[PDB]
Design a protein around this motif. Sequence first.
Motif, short mmCIF file in Angstrom:
data_model
loop_
_atom_site.label_atom_id
_atom_site.label_comp_id
_atom_site.label_asym_id
_atom_site.label_seq_id
_atom_site.Cartn_x
_atom_site.Cartn_y
_atom_site.Cartn_z
N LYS A 118 -33.71 37.91 -13.12
CA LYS A 118 -32.63 38.32 -14.03
C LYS A 118 -33.14 38.96 -15.29
CE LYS A 118 -28.53 35.48 -13.41
NZ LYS A 118 -27.48 34.64 -14.07
N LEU A 119 -32.51 40.04 -15.73
CA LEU A 119 -32.91 40.62 -16.96
C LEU A 119 -32.64 39.66 -18.14
CD1 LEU A 119 -32.02 44.34 -16.67
CD2 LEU A 119 -34.13 43.22 -16.41
N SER A 120 -33.50 39.64 -19.13
CA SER A 120 -33.30 38.80 -20.32
C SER A 120 -33.13 39.75 -21.49
CB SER A 120 -34.51 37.93 -20.54
OG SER A 120 -35.55 38.70 -21.06
N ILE A 121 -32.80 39.22 -22.65
CA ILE A 121 -32.49 40.11 -23.73
C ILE A 121 -33.74 40.85 -24.22
CG2 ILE A 121 -30.39 38.74 -24.33
CD1 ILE A 121 -31.72 37.82 -26.74
N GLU A 122 -34.93 40.33 -23.89
CA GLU A 122 -36.21 40.98 -24.23
C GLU A 122 -36.53 42.23 -23.40
OE1 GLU A 122 -36.24 37.61 -23.85
OE2 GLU A 122 -36.55 37.08 -25.95
N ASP A 123 -35.88 42.39 -22.25
CA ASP A 123 -36.04 43.56 -21.41
C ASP A 123 -35.22 44.73 -21.93
OD1 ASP A 123 -37.58 42.17 -19.36
OD2 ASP A 123 -35.71 41.28 -18.64
N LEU A 124 -34.45 44.53 -22.99
CA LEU A 124 -33.50 45.55 -23.44
C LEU A 124 -34.05 46.95 -23.60
CD1 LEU A 124 -30.70 46.19 -24.07
CD2 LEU A 124 -30.94 45.56 -26.57
N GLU A 125 -35.14 47.12 -24.33
CA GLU A 125 -35.60 48.49 -24.66
C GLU A 125 -36.17 49.18 -23.44
OE1 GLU A 125 -34.26 49.14 -27.82
OE2 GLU A 125 -34.31 47.07 -28.54
N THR A 126 -36.97 48.46 -22.64
CA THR A 126 -37.51 49.05 -21.40
C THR A 126 -36.36 49.36 -20.44
OG1 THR A 126 -38.06 47.03 -20.26
CG2 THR A 126 -39.62 47.90 -21.68
N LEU A 127 -35.32 48.56 -20.47
CA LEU A 127 -34.19 48.80 -19.60
C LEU A 127 -33.43 50.05 -20.02
CD1 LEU A 127 -32.24 48.02 -17.35
CD2 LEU A 127 -31.21 46.47 -18.98
N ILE A 128 -33.31 50.27 -21.31
CA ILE A 128 -32.65 51.46 -21.75
C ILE A 128 -33.36 52.67 -21.15
CG2 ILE A 128 -32.15 53.01 -23.64
CD1 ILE A 128 -31.90 50.60 -25.55
N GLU A 129 -34.69 52.72 -21.22
CA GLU A 129 -35.43 53.89 -20.71
C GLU A 129 -35.25 54.01 -19.23
OE1 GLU A 129 -36.28 55.62 -23.27
OE2 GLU A 129 -36.08 53.83 -24.61
N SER A 175 -45.36 42.65 -14.65
CA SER A 175 -44.80 42.71 -15.99
C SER A 175 -44.18 44.03 -16.43
CB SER A 175 -45.91 42.44 -16.99
OG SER A 175 -45.89 41.08 -17.38
N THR A 176 -44.19 45.03 -15.59
CA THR A 176 -43.53 46.28 -15.91
C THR A 176 -42.20 46.49 -15.17
OG1 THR A 176 -45.76 47.10 -16.01
CG2 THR A 176 -44.02 48.66 -16.26
N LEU A 177 -41.13 46.78 -15.89
CA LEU A 177 -39.87 47.04 -15.23
C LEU A 177 -39.89 48.35 -14.51
CD1 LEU A 177 -36.97 45.87 -14.81
CD2 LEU A 177 -36.28 47.30 -16.60
N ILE A 178 -39.65 48.30 -13.22
CA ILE A 178 -39.69 49.49 -12.38
C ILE A 178 -38.41 49.77 -11.64
CG2 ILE A 178 -42.12 49.23 -12.02
CD1 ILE A 178 -41.57 48.14 -9.23
N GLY A 179 -37.49 48.82 -11.61
CA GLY A 179 -36.19 49.05 -11.05
C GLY A 179 -35.22 47.96 -11.43
N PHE A 180 -33.95 48.16 -11.06
CA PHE A 180 -32.91 47.18 -11.29
C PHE A 180 -31.69 47.37 -10.40
CE2 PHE A 180 -29.68 49.61 -13.25
CZ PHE A 180 -30.32 50.63 -13.94
N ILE A 181 -30.79 46.39 -10.47
CA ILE A 181 -29.55 46.41 -9.72
C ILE A 181 -28.56 45.67 -10.54
CG2 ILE A 181 -29.89 44.14 -8.55
CD1 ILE A 181 -28.49 45.32 -6.14
N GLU A 182 -27.37 46.24 -10.67
CA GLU A 182 -26.33 45.67 -11.49
C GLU A 182 -25.08 45.66 -10.69
OE1 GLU A 182 -25.16 48.01 -14.85
OE2 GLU A 182 -24.25 46.22 -15.84
N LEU A 183 -24.37 44.52 -10.74
CA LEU A 183 -23.15 44.32 -10.05
C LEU A 183 -22.07 43.68 -10.94
CD1 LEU A 183 -25.33 42.71 -7.51
CD2 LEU A 183 -23.55 43.75 -6.37
N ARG A 213 -24.86 49.92 -9.90
CA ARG A 213 -26.06 50.72 -9.82
C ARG A 213 -27.25 50.03 -9.26
NH1 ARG A 213 -23.25 51.56 -15.67
NH2 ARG A 213 -24.71 50.26 -16.90
N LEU A 214 -28.04 50.82 -8.56
CA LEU A 214 -29.27 50.36 -7.97
C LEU A 214 -30.28 51.46 -8.17
CD1 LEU A 214 -31.25 49.04 -6.53
CD2 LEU A 214 -29.99 48.84 -4.48
N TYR A 215 -31.43 51.11 -8.75
CA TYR A 215 -32.44 52.10 -9.01
C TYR A 215 -33.89 51.63 -9.02
CZ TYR A 215 -35.23 55.46 -11.49
OH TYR A 215 -36.22 56.38 -11.87
#
Length: 165
Positions: free
Chosen positions: A13-24, A78-86, A97-99
């Motif tokens: 699960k994404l946490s609030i610390e992933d915010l900036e990398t998630l934006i990119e 430790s590097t965000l490389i993809g995500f999925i949101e439902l 989205r899935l990426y």
Amino acid sequence: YFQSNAMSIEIRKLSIEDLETLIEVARESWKWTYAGIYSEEYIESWIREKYSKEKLLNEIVRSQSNLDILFLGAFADSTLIGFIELKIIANKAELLRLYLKPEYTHKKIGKTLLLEAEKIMKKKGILECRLYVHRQNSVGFSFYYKNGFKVEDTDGSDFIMEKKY
């Protein structure tokens, strides 16, 4: 083996610390979903409104609070490389989205993200999942049918696709 220059590839699960990398990473999930459709101008703008710090924060918090959103990230060492949101309303879900970043676009990772997303949804009781896929997006369309979704309708430029559990 992997070719992703990392000794571990994982989903949580994404946490609030992933915010900036998630934006990119969200900003690109979009330039790719539409690089062949909207203008440069319009793409650079629309990301501002949809991937603002506040809206992405709203969504990670809601996923973290077990409310109407589920937001998982895929990380290579430790590097965000993809995500999925439902979105989860009652007993139904919508896959928003899935990426995966191009460099890590191995159908096993995308499948791992979707797979962990369903394990969590079983437990919550979601019995149905819908998704929208642009008609030219053949890679997505293919990935989707291979993992159980069927075409239910068209919404002009998109296939509405579905999968029951």
